[PDB]
Design a protein around this ligand. Sequence first.
Ligand SMILES: C[C@@H](O)[C@H](NC(=O)OP(=O)(O)OC[C@H]1O[C@@H](n2cnc3c(N)ncnc32)[C@H](O)[C@@H]1O)C(=O)O
Ligand SMILES: [Mg+2]
Length: 321
Amino acid sequence: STRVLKVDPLFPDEKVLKEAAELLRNGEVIIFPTETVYGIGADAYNEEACKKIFKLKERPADNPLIVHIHSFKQLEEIAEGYEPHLDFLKKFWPGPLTVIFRKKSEKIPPVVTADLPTVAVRMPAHPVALKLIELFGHPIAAPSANISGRPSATNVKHVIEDFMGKVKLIIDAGDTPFGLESTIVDLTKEKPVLLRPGPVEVERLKELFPELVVPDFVRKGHYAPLKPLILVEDLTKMEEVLKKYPDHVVICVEERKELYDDRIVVGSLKNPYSIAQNIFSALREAEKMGKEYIIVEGFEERGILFAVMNRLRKAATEIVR
Ligand SMILES: C[C@@H](O)[C@H](NC(=O)OP(=O)(O)OC[C@H]1O[C@@H](n2cnc3c(N)ncnc32)[C@H](O)[C@@H]1O)C(=O)O
Ligand SMILES: [Mg+2]
């Protein structure tokens, strides 16, 4: 019997958080907001509880979980070799950044890290997440709140779609600020490696780390709707595509809304953060509009839209370059 408890994002009712903390202590899984996407979390030191996350998501065991912390002191408990990067961390944490370090803790079971000698760590800039972790007293292991393969939940409506009846508690703090998962940066190798683009933008990381490596899998290509998805990087072929795929809905920017008939406006190029904020909602709307094909306009591989494109490329059933 899933309880959905609404809380203020800045000053959440600590009584709701306590209820959540209790469930975590009982080895239950709960869903909570962050500034990026909703997470589905368990006690990070509880092997059995973390196993439930995999079951509930229908997730491969080889796909490791991000461990969420509230203090730099917790970092010492779980990781080693981070001391040269403390200046960096203190500049972006709390915030939408996940970093890979060598695993110290034997407190974090292998299921969490998929037997890897590394651990992904994030200190989320969302008062609800921070206050929950602190009150609970252990780190929380949490992937995104969605059935594996599907778009990451950015609001409680999407969470309910995927998890009503399957978890005891969803904390609702409204639509997540960014709409997109944290930037993941691997700091275990000699040169830092970008594993996932996010709200900490590539251009910013390149300023800080001139030798940042951006693997091919980041630039090429999860987050997938139920209907086939057609991504159109070259918008001159838009007309060809529309006519090739007749029974369709289009996801488009505002400045090209008038150029279609059946269209979801995801946001404006004027304010690209609007596009990031709404893109996953758009895919969930689209898949329900009773059309055979979802057709999405492409975006610049720059700033936050880089992250958007990363997500769409990984979701698309066909790309049109
Ligand atoms: C809940 C919210 O904080 C959200 N979490 C999230 O997106 O979790 P998830 O859906 O599990 O994505 C986790 C990603 O993190 C990577 N990952 C985790 N631990 C890793 C490790 N030790 N080495 C490399 N990649 C790792 C996984 O491969 C995967 O791509 C976020 O990071 O914004
Ligand atoms: Mg995910």
